[PDB]
Design a protein around this ligand. Structure first.
Ligand SMILES: [Mg+2]
Ligand SMILES: [Mg+2]
Ligand SMILES: [Mg+2]
Ligand SMILES: [Mg+2]
Lengths: 80, 354, 95, 52, 49, 146, 41, 111
RNA sequence: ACCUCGGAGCAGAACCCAACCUCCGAGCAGUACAUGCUAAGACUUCACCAGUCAAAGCGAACCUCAAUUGAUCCA
């Protein structure tokens, strides 16, 4: 559960919420996966490294979407 | 051994007697036009059009539209011409055209384009997007009523639905403002339907709005037979189509078998088929307006799935078929250690019985 | 080759085969392309890469090299950091 | 008529490559891709290997 | 292999385990004349040890 | 057992029937090949300009051949503002009209394939400038093969 | 020490590099100018 | 005597490698040719020895199409502009009709 | 007299096909300096050796030619 994770500081916690809301379930817990090995030891190590990298990042196609959004603004331009 | 041709040869009607008399393509453009016409010609041999083009049935797709408006061609061409020579009599028009500094009013151009030729272009684009194939099973109609729809966002801002732009469901959360020019005493029905977006049925679609029995231009006084649900395209499911359908109704029609309840937040109850709707109600209304748009997943769509629809949000992703990799030989004669890597499963070392 | 040595009465090994070819334990032989260090100013880059590849051999060539080498070279070697450790075995090979 | 010549990098990486040039021309100076520094740097002619 | 030997009782876990105990339990075969330098503990089956 | 919601019945394979779906996801096929002929048919949408002796026609068409959007000086809505339908003013006007219609239709990326004399002509340069300042990009993005 | 001397020599050459880029480019342009003068002759 | 020398070169083994209706994979060479006998069509690429390979996986189809060269190809454009009016040049083209879709959308999570 | 490589006929239409058979050539030249790296799938001169094409990807940019050639060891 991301919000009730007291080992994570507050500002980094809402930063992780707004950054990895793609990985937040409806009950409010972060879910992280690893499949890169046939050893569950190494899979768990990868999951913990994902948690650690995610926390330290909080502590610290795109062209297509940009052009489509600019054209959407060009259609948006009309005032009342 | 020879076989005679099954039809006329291509360069057969050209006379080969003396080649110096015949007129000639001196231009690649002229040859390109002639070759494109010959490519569009049917032909009796095998053709890229035969193997790749869409084989639609020659059913001469039926018109279920309104009859076209009648115009007097003689006075129409008279007024068009007199506009032409008054503009050609204005002296500064020549100066602007020759100095290449002239311009054109796009708002007036677009308004009377909607007046004159906009319905046929809108019908063509609807056929390209495939609503007449999906929503109406092949049948076509020319949309003869301009269905201007915009979405109230911000406090001064409008997100429109003309004929297929991208509108995010953040902008499509609330009910859009609709106007279409009309006269008193004529009834209407407006419909919003999401064609792509049915999470279970690959054939059916979703009804998002079924406003019925509209007195006129006023769209706030009709029967709300289904509340507006904002579009919810699933994440990674691609770009979905939503259609506004406007129907001219002559008589009042009871809508009791198609009356969605007080707030209806069930996808099974919101399942719809416009084909069955128009089949049941065919002798009652005739479609006259059509305005569609496209939508993608958003944080709004997450909100609509989670709190409104009481749903766990489905996640889809686009995955490719696995590569070919032919049957593995015992002696890969001139292949590499990369061939062995191709047929390997796991990248980690194995030790067998040890 | 020497099928029976004059000193031990044993089959001998061809050291040309030893210093030219590498035998994986699965039964395959790995070699280099002939002329991979010759006339690279003449050779085109795709051809140069094709010559820089490591390639396998025929069934016939592999059988010849197995006959020319002794059974010491066919053993399983558990080297410390062998780059061909993952190539020493066949995976998903049907018939 | 021609000669095969070795041109080394000016990045000091020790990278070098062989091209051909007419014998009656001067020492070559080219802009070639150096993979050690991952960019295009000057190479100039240091040696002649053989006659072409 | 180590867990199999321990469970079959060929290797005593209550005593320190070295090359003598592994060879006496016949879990490994060591050929020092064939340039073997000992036993490397590899990671196969770390999930069930 | 927890009673499953009847709304939670989702198919394990989504079926998106939008003809623009994979094209806008940039995972759709472009018809590669035809390297020995002209024009190249590796595109999704194409701008084609027909300069007849009276009129200037401009089409946005898919690779299959259906016309997506059209804009002509043949129409009154353009005739009543042009002095003549054969100018670079005519081409600039039809470019501004067609750029607006393409923004309206959602066609943001296209491939324009002119001949050398077309591209060197002032009409097509004013056409491309009008399209670019209207808002459409005359270069399609690359297909995502992997 | 050997790696550090190597990378220092590379870093020095690369610090000096862009000026050699631009002066060799203008030298090549001057070669083209003398070539067009000679074929103008 | 017999002052004729050379001419001992073997056959090139060129020609069609994949006929009509044959299932083809991506990268399989369809035809090898010294001159442009068969032209590339849809989803068929050409390699610099004029070889034809399948750019996609599907069914090989041989069709006959009109020939419009590139306006920079000088010899071809001269032949076209020297062709009399009413005549359209034809060539034989090779296509690969792709068999599978590019991919599928399938369920991966229930967030 | 010839010995290696390529093109045309013999060998008319998938492939292949000989003669101290009939003709013509080759043992380079020019451009470039990403002519960088890498990697699915294939072709193959009837073996092998050798040779040929190439999707995607990284990084950049925004080759012509028909043959035009020589293995290992060793230096
Ligand atoms: Mg011959
Ligand atoms: Mg022969
Ligand atoms: Mg072969
Ligand atoms: Mg590539």
């Amino acid at each position: 559960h991301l919000a009730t994770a007291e080992w994570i500081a507050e500002p980094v916690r809402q930063k992780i919420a707004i950054t990895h809301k793609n990985k937040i379930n409806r009950l409010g817990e972060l879910i992280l996966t690893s499949e890169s090995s046939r050893y569950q030891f190494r899979n768990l190590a990868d999951c913990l490294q994902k948690i650690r990298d995610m926390i330290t990042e909080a502590s610290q196609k795109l062209h297509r979407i940009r052009i489509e959004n600019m054209n959407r603004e060009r259609l948006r331009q009309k005032r009342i | 051994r020879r076989t005679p041709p099954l039809g006329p040869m291509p360069n057969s009607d050209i006379d080969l007697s003396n080649l110096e008399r015949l007129e000639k393509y001196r231009s690649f453009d002229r040859y390109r036009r002639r070759a494109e016409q010959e490519a569009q010609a049917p032909h009796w041999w095998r053709t890229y059009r035969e193997y790749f083009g869409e084989k639609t049935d020659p059913k001469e797709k039926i018109d279920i539209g309104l009859p076209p408006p009648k115009v007097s061609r003689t006075q129409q061409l008279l007024e068009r011409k007199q506009a032409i020579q008054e503009l050609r009599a204005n002296v500064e028009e020549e100066r602007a055209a020759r100095l290449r500094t002239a311009s054109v009013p796009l708002d007036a151009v677009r308004a009377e384009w909607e007046r004159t030729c906009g319905p046929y272009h809108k019908q063509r684009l609807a056929e390209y997007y495939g609503l007449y194939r999906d929503l109406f099973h092949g049948a076509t109609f020319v949309p003869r009523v301009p269905l201007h729809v915009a979405y109230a966002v911000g406090e001064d801002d409008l997100m429109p639905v003309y004929c297929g732009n991208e509108v995010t469901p953040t902008e499509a959360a609330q009910a859009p403002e609709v106007t279409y020019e009309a006269e008193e005493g004529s009834l209407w029905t407006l419909l919003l339907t999401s064609l792509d977006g049915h999470l279970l049925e690959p054939d059916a679609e979703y009804l998002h709005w079924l406003l019925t029995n509209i007195p006129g231009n006023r769209v706030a006084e009709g029967q709300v037979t289904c509340p507006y649900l904002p579009p919810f395209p699933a994440r990674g499911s691609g770009i979905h189509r939503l259609a506004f359908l406007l129907f001219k109704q002559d008589q009042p029609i009871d809508f009791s078998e198609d009356a969605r309840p007080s707030p209806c937040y069930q996808l099974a109850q919101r399942t719809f088929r416009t084909f069955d709707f128009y089949k049941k109600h065919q002798e009652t209304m005739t479609p006259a307006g059509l305005s569609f748009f496209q939508c993608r997943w958003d944080d709004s769509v997450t909100y609509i799935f989670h709190q409104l629809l009481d749903m766990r949000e489905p996640v889809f992703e686009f995955v490719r078929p696995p590569p070919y990799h032919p049957k593995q030989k015992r002696f890969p004669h001139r292949q590499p250690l990369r061939y062995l890597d191709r047929y390997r499963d796991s990248h980690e070392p194995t030790y067998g019985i040890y | 080759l020497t099928y029976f040595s004059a000193r031990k009465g044993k089959r001998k090994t061809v050291k040309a085969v030893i210093d030219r070819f590498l035998r994986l334990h699965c039964g395959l032989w790995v070699r280099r392309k002939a002329g991979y260090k010759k006339k690279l100013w003449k050779k085109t880059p795709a051809r140069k890469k094709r010559l820089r590849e490591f390639v396998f051999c025929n069934k016939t060539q592999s059988k010849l090299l197995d006959k020319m080498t002794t059974s010491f070279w066919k053993r399983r070697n558990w080297y410390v950091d062998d780059p061909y450790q993952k190539y020493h075995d066949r995976t998903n090979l049907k018939v | 008529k021609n000669i095969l010549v070795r041109m080394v990098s000016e990045a000091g990486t020790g990278f070098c490559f062989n091209t051909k040039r007419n014998r009656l021309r001067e020492k070559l100076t080219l802009l070639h891709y150096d993979p050690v520094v991952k960019q295009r740097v000057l190479f100039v002619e240091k040696k002649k290997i053989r006659s072409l | 292999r180590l867990q199999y030997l321990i469970d079959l009782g060929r290797v005593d876990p209550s005593q320190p385990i070295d090359l003598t105990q592994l060879v006496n339990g016949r879990g490994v075969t060591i050929q020092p004349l064939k340039r073997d330098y000992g036993v490397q503990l590899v990671e196969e089956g770390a999930d069930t040890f | 057992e927890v009673d499953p919601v009847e709304n939670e019945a989702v198919a394990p394979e989504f079926t998106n029937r939008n003809p623009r779906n994979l094209e806008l996801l940039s995972v759709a096929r472009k018809e590669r090949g035809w390297r020995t002929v002209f024009p190249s048919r590796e595109f999704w949408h194409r701008l084609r300009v027909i300069r007849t002796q009276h009129h200037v026609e401009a089409l946005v068409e898919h690779q299959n051949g259906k016309v997506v959007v059209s804009a002509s000086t043949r129409e009154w809505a353009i005739k009543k503002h042009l002095y003549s339908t054969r100018n670079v003013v005519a081409c600039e006007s039809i470019g501004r009209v067609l750029a607006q219609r393409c923004l309206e239709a959602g066609i943001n990326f296209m491939v324009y394939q002119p001949t050398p004399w077309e591209a060197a002509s002032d009409s097509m340069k004013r056409l491309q400038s009008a399209m670019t300042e209207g808002g459409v990009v005359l270069r399609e993005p690359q297909r995502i093969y992997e | 020490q050997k790696r550090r001397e190597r990378e220092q020599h590379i870093a020095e050459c690369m610090a000096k590099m862009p000026q050699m880029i631009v002066n060799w480019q203008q030298q090549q342009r001057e070669n083209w100018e003398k070539a067009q003068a000679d074929k103008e002759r | 005597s017999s002052k004729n020398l050379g001419g001992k070169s073997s056959g090139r083994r060129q020609g069609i490698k994949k006929m009509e209706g044959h299932y083809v994979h991506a990268g399989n060479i369809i035809a090898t040719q010294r001159h442009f006998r068969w032209h590339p069509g849809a989803h068929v690429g050409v390699g610099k020895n004029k070889c034809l390979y399948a750019l996609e996986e599907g069914i090989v189809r041989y069709t006959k199409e009109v020939y419009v060269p590139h306006p920079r190809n000088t010899e071809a454009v001269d032949l076209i502009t020297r062709l009399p009016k009413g005549a359209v040049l034809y060539k034989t083209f090779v296509h690969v009709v792709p068999a599978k879709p590019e991919g599928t959308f399938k369920l991966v999570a229930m967030l």
